[PDB]
Amino acid sequence: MMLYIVFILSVIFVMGFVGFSSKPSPIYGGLGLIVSGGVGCGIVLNFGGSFLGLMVFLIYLGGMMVVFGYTTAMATEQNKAVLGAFVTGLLMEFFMVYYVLKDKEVEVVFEFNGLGDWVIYDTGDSGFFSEEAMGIAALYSYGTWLVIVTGWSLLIGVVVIMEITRGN
Amino acid sequence: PFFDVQKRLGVDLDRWMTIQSAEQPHKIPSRCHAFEKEWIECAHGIGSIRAEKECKIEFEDFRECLLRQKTMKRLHAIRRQREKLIKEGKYTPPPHHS
Amino acid sequence: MNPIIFIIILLTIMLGTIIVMISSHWLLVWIGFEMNMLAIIPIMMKNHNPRATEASTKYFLTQSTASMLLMMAVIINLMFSGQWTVMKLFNPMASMLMTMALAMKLGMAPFHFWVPEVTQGIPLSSGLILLTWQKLAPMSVLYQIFPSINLNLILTLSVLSILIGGWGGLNQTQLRKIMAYSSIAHMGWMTAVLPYNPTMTLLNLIIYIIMTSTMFTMFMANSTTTTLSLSHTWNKTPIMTVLILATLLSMGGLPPLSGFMPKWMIIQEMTKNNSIILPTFMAITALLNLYFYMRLTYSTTLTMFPSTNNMKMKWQFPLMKKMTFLPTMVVLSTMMLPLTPMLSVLE
Amino acid sequence: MWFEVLPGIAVMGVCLFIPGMATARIHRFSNGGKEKRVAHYPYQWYLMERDRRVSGVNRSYVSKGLENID
Amino acid sequence: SMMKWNRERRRLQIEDFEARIALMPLLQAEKDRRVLQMLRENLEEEATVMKDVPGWKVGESVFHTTRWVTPMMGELYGLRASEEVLSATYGFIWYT
Amino acid sequence: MFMINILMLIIPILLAVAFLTLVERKVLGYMQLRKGPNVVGPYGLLQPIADAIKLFIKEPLRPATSSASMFILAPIMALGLALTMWIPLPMPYPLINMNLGVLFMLAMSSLAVYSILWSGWASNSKYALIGALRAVAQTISYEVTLAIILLSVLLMSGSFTLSTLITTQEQMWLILPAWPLAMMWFISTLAETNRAPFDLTEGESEGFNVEYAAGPFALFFMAEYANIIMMNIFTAILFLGTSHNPHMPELYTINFTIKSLLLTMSFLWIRASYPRFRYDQLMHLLWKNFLPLTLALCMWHVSLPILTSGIPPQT
Amino acid sequence: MSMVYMNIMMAFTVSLVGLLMYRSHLMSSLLCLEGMMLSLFVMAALTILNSHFTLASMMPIILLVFAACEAALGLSLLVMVSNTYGTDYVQNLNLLQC
Amino acid sequence: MNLMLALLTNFTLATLLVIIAFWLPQLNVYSEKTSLPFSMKFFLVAITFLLFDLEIALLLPLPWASQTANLNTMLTMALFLIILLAVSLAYEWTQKGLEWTE
Amino acid sequence: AERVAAFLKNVWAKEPVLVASFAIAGLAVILPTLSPYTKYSLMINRATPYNYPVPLRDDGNMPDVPSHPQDPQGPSLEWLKRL
Numbered sequence A: 001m002m003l004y005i006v007f008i009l010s011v012i013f014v015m016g017f018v019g020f021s022s023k024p025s026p027i028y029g030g031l032g033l034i035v036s037g038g039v040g041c042g043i044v045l046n047f048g049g050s051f052l053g054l055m056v057f058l059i060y061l062g063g064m065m066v067v068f069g070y071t072t073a074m075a076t077e078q079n080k081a082v083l084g085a086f087v088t089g090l091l092m093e094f095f096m097v098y099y100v101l102k103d104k105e106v107e108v109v110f111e112f113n114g115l116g117d118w119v120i121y122d123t124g125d126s127g128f129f130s131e132e133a134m135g136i137a138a139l140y141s142y143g144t145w146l147v148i149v150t151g152w153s154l155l156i157g158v159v160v161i162m163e164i165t166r167g168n
Numbered sequence B: 001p002f003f004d005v006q007k008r009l010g011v012d013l014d015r016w017m018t019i020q021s022a023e024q025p026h027k028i029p030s031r032c033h034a035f036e037k038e039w040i041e042c043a044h045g046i047g048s049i050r051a052e053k054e055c056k057i058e059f060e061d062f063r064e065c066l067l068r069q070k071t072m073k074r075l076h077a078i079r080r081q082r083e084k085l086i087k088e089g090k091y092t093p094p095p096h097h098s
Numbered sequence C: 001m002n003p004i005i006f007i008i009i010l011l012t013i014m015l016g017t018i019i020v021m022i023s024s025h026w027l028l029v030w031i032g033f034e035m036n037m038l039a040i041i042p043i044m045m046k047n048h049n050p051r052a053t054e055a056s057t058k059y060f061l062t063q064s065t066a067s068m069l070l071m072m073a074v075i076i077n078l079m080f081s082g083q084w085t086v087m088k089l090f091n092p093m094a095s096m097l098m099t100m101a102l103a104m105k106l107g108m109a110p111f112h113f114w115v116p117e118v119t120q121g122i123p124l125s126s127g128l129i130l131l132t133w134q135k136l137a138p139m140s141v142l143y144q145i146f147p148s149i150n151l152n153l154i155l156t157l158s159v160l161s162i163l164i165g166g167w168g169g170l171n172q173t174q175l176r177k178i179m180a181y182s183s184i185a186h187m188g189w190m191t192a193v194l195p196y197n198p199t200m201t202l203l204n205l206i207i208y209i210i211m212t213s214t215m216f217t218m219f220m221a222n223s224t225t226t227t228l229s230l231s232h233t234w235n236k237t238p239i240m241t242v243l244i245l246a247t248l249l250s251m252g253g254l255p256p257l258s259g260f261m262p263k264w265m266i267i268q269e270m271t272k273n274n275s276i277i278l279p280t281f282m283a284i285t286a287l288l289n290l291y292f293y294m295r296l297t298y299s300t301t302l303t304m305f306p307s308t309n310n311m312k313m314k315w316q317f318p319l320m321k322k323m324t325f326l327p328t329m330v331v332l333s334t335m336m337l338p339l340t341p342m343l344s345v346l347e
Numbered sequence D: 001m002w003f004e005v006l007p008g009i010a011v012m013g014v015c016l017f018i019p020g021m022a023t024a025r026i027h028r029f030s031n032g033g034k035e036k037r038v039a040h041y042p043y044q045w046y047l048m049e050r051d052r053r054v055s056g057v058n059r060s061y062v063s064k065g066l067e068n069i070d
Numbered sequence E: 001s002m003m004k005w006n007r008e009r010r011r012l013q014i015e016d017f018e019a020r021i022a023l024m025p026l027l028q029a030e031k032d033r034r035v036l037q038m039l040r041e042n043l044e045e046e047a048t049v050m051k052d053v054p055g056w057k058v059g060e061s062v063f064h065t066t067r068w069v070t071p072m073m074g075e076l077y078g079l080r081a082s083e084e085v086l087s088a089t090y091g092f093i094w095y096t
Numbered sequence F: 001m002f003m004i005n006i007l008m009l010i011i012p013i014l015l016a017v018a019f020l021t022l023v024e025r026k027v028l029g030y031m032q033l034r035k036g037p038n039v040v041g042p043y044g045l046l047q048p049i050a051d052a053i054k055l056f057i058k059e060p061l062r063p064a065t066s067s068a069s070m071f072i073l074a075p076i077m078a079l080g081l082a083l084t085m086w087i088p089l090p091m092p093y094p095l096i097n098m099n100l101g102v103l104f105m106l107a108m109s110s111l112a113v114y115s116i117l118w119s120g121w122a123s124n125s126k127y128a129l130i131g132a133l134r135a136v137a138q139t140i141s142y143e144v145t146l147a148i149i150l151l152s153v154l155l156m157s158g159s160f161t162l163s164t165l166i167t168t169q170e171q172m173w174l175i176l177p178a179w180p181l182a183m184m185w186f187i188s189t190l191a192e193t194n195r196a197p198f199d200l201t202e203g204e205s206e207g208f209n210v211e212y213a214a215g216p217f218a219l220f221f222m223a224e225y226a227n228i229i230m231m232n233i234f235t236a237i238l239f240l241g242t243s244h245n246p247h248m249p250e251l252y253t254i255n256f257t258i259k260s261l262l263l264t265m266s267f268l269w270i271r272a273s274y275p276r277f278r279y280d281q282l283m284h285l286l287w288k289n290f291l292p293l294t295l296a297l298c299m300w301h302v303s304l305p306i307l308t309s310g311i312p313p314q315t
Numbered sequence G: 001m002s003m004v005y006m007n008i009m010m011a012f013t014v015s016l017v018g019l020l021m022y023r024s025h026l027m028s029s030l031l032c033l034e035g036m037m038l039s040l041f042v043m044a045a046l047t048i049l050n051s052h053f054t055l056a057s058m059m060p061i062i063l064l065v066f067a068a069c070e071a072a073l074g075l076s077l078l079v080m081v082s083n084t085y086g087t088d089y090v091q092n093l094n095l096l097q098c
Numbered sequence H: 001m002n003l004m005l006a007l008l009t010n011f012t013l014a015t016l017l018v019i020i021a022f023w024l025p026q027l028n029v030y031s032e033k034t035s036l037p038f039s040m041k042f043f044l045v046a047i048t049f050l051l052f053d054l055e056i057a058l059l060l061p062l063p064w065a066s067q068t069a070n071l072n073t074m075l076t077m078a079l080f081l082i083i084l085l086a087v088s089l090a091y092e093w094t095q096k097g098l099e100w101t102e
Numbered sequence I: 001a002e003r004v005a006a007f008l009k010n011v012w013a014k015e016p017v018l019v020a021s022f023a024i025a026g027l028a029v030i031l032p033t034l035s036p037y038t039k040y041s042l043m044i045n046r047a048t049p050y051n052y053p054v055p056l057r058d059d060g061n062m063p064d065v066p067s068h069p070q071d072p073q074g075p076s077l078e079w080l081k082r083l
């Protein structure tokens, strides 16, 4: 059962998405996006991406969802459609899981497989470095153009946000 | 590109990351590097209209390496038969497989 | 805004479009849209009133939604091809999402609902950037992925755009709503000829941009946003009425004016491909655009509407607005038909 | 007097000493008297798995020297 | 002091990387045999399990090319104990 | 044996927290010409037990909360993350030897800001929520210098592993080449942990946990005091590295523990010496004093190894 | 492709359908927009990490940086709406073509 | 597997203490008791932290980036990013964005 | 110059923190282009073998390529040991 950790995490990932997608109060919707983000980190970790996994925790959850919750606290006042939507999404996920395990194969737009995510992993790895770390670190040797446009857009974000919020 | 500034100026802006067969840090290869090299070399300079039918073998192999659809179906066939011969007590796996 | 900051923001609007147009990598195309949208919001809120806040909010929600569909197309195209190159997409589902993402960014029907309301709620200067410059990047991408665009989908968006834009403008008195619907109608013409000859998409885009720019510039000169405020122009700047007449007839596709050239060349290309019913349907339906262009001519140039006594105070002061390139644009937008075979410079 | 503050400090020190002493002794107890093997990169993991097969027993902290060679 | 010490560490890192380089030929040779052996075992239980299925050929590639294709984890450990499949797949990521 | 290892970590942390309250009350007393707790037990050693029993049998205070589920989530998150920031610490051998241990601690400490935020919502007090927003703003602001300062010290270590900071400092403490960063790092840990002179949450006449009294309030207190020890342990590993002898690991722990206690005591030392900042003044300290200097020292510490040929190893 | 893609790709659909169906709160919709990015982040990371496309490993970080910058603009617009009407309900934004 | 088991213990222990701390008091059976305006400056500090945080994400891989053979390119890009981060601080500073007086 | 010898003293008296910041940032931009040890940094990053040195097939006209790792040909790291 431990060999299907990624798939088990993938179900929790969807269930969290049905949580905040049914659009409960923003306080609880933001709680469902923190859980899904945490489960999203786990899936990336189990594919060999450790730096990418921790970026979600440090930036997506620690930096971006904090601002979403912080903004909700002061810019929001604080149903029978949230419950109906949530029930529909959970049933939709359950049927997919049943048919991807019972038959081991489902077809919705794309053709999926149910053997397990481990069957596609690479069988050869003997380097003395982390492959994703070398790729990410290459942003400074190769991604000169990426850095310039990315850094410029962050600077413009500061300029733009201050224009919008001045109010005069 | 709509405007091919990169080719005119001879400056590489984003072509370094367009394909997975390009130069990588520390010469780390991609899992489908060999297949992509063949498809890109088959369909070089003949256009997409010719390439869509003259390089279909290279692309189908490349598509198989990427998503492994035909590899997984064959394995799934092996496993279904194996389990059908064990619910009917008709197959004993060897010790090195158990 | 501080004048220097205004220029920095415009250069970033232009830089994002240029990044989309010079990019061989799908990620840089997405970054160009993100940068372009980031720097367009501040100029949509330069007046700081509720109607500009709503317009920017509706614009933000539509463009952000389209930007996420565009990313999904790129990742799906990556899963099935393993490459990021800006070219034909290697999956039918990726093509539909990219086409619908670019249709939402352009405002084509049935994703058109934002274009009229966003334009009405922002100043004329920002509406001009919205309806002319913002269509250069989505059309640049469509120019490159058209070999893998579903023919039925793209021609369905075109027909709907021509119909909705034609019918929508009939019920309008606000100029910025009239120009918004005229924009949707012309988007359909650009994308209907895309499968057959994408060089006639550039021709229609260039002529439309010139004509649209001329129109907004003359609305900014007199600070007119309504039909009745534009009908006082004969009693202040009579010359500006004749130029509006000429530019409105050209937008309607009447010969011998420039605005006939796109409609003329698109029909020529579609009939070469044995497409007879569609060009006929589009040409006739475009008479809806001509109708509400002709209404503006009646109330601006061909009749003298009632004036106001305070108007007599305006006769003493000149026009101090820049009206940049207006003499050049109005001539290019009306007198270019004899130079039609010059379109091959776009090849 | 100030030295009457020390008995409280002594308890903190002992409590903070236990986690680091316990980990060191448990690692040596669980790894045949040696430090726990550190595998931060996939090459170090490949060797650890190779020792697990060479061990004869399914434990990578049991080393084989020049006695398995003929 | 940090310059002096970090240069020594880079010299110690080159020594460690060269010890790895001197062993890679030996490790590579045995990895090839282990990979080939596991494929051979799978090709034998496939013949036994798929002798009655009609139209089935034993050992048929899914690729049009005859070039060697590095197998994925689902072809080496297809029919082995899940304990050693888990170690092969998630062992490194989970270690400490 | 691993489950025993976790308990050998969790339990002493809570006992270290328990008797840090005693040590804080005596140290402040002796700097104030007092004696501190010396009646309840000999030298006050039983004072922490009396407080614990008293708090956990006092009447619950919970008033009407709009997000009762959020009321229970905040203490769990605060105390779960406080213990989770200890598992990668090398002392000298970590419980979970992570290759990215430094990033793991930044990531977990950037989630503890939710406990502040959720407790403000679950209090149904518009003046408690304002207090939480101020507390959140201060915390995230000083997380910027912690990451940039930490990134500048790793450019001399060469990796995000916490155990490599031991090797990097085998000849010399990193405080000597990076004392400007240590000064700002140390004050950031004060502001991050909401300790004096940055404890404007305790501006009685000038907190978000008021809706917690006894029980859950005791758990928030343990989480906060557990982070002070962890931050000061992190400071010692980062700027006062201890020599590690593989054959005598306990020698490291004794020396390492003494350093981590002195830094913890200095937090009490500071609390007894200064008045506290206004809210705007501790923001101007970060945005207009620390951030300009931290950015300048990050540029310097990226270029310094390159220009001296002292780039550290990747492994 | 692999049943992990089945759920991540279904996560995107749930967030897309959640975004296109507003209830009352603008903030609730901005969360669905930020849930789509997370689903894209995970989908993009899995494909790159599995295929050993080393240079592409920086792409998910760039996606996170721009979408967070976009989200900051979204909150700013939401804050300006709240100041005007006191609440962030999307039903007050109908002055244009009411 | 150790990390998964380590996180489970810490939050399970925290969960147990929270519940007993809510219920252990509820056995004394005590007598029945029978008894914001938005600030734009708090939002601006939260947004500014986010944009600085996104810049920190780009700077985090610097320790690995210094191991490359293109040091002239890497050092330029590294200093460019940090400098542009300083420009943002300079811009907010000069536009009265860091003030707290209304 | 009273302009440059009086402005500097003013900032050093009113904003000593910013003066230090700009001095530290300035040196971080200038010194790398002037240091004589910057070249060594680049040489050391090149001498770190991360991958296997795949041998070259010997065609009989490659005098400068060693046949055995201990032969006198090929790159040498003597500069590093003496650094």
Ligand SMILES: CCCCCCCCCCCCCCCCCC(=O)OC[C@H](COP(=O)([O-])OCC(O)COP(=O)([O-])OC[C@@H](COC(=O)CCCCCCCCCCCCCCCCC)OC(=O)CCCCCCCCCCCCCCCCC)OC(=O)CCCCCCCCCCCCCCCCC
Pocket (backbone or CB within 6 Å): C234, C238, C239, C241, C242, C243, C245, C246, C249, C256, C257, C301, C302, C334, C335, C336, C337, C338
């Ligand atoms: C190489 C041989 C050279 C000869 C060639 C023949 C000439 C061809 C010229 C064609 C280009 C025309 C534009 C350039 C001249 C504009 C100069 C100007 O505006 O001031 C005039 C200027 C005014 O003199 P003024 O002593 O100062 O008295 C006025 C006061 O200053 C001020 O007193 P005001 O305030 O009372 O004045 C207000 C206003 C009066 O305002 C009003 O209240 C009247 C409102 C009701 C009038 C409605 C009739 C509007 C007629 C124009 C319709 C436009 C659509 C064109 C459709 C084509 C078929 C017509 O008066 C006007 O200025 C309006 C006339 C100018 C309109 C500009 C039209 C530009 C668009 C033309 C597009 C043409 C497309 C042709 C097809 C393309 C193939 C090439 O006249 C002259 O002094 C000499 C200039 C000679 C040109 C006269 C203008 C005629 C243009 C309209 C006829 C279009 C003919 C098209 C034939 C197509 C077949 C080939």
Ligand SMILES: CCCCCCCCCCCCCCCCCC(=O)OC[C@H](COP(=O)([O-])OCC[N+](C)(C)C)OC(=O)CCCCCCCCCCCCCCCCC
Pocket (backbone or CB within 6 Å): F180, F182, F183, F184, F186, F187, F197, F235, F239, F270, F274, F285, F289, F290, F293, F300, I014, I015, I017, I020, I024, I027
């Ligand atoms: C060749 C060399 C090149 C590289 C050189 C790089 C370094 C050069 C030297 C840099 C200068 C040193 C910077 C030090 C940090 C300065 C921060 C600053 O801005 O200060 C001014 C700031 C602000 O000063 P201010 O409030 O007076 O106002 C300054 C600005 N004006 C005047 C315009 C308003 O002061 C503080 O930081 C005080 C914070 C409160 C501290 C309370 C607790 C005190 C605890 C003391 C014990 C600390 C022990 C630390 C050791 C920890 C051990 C682990």
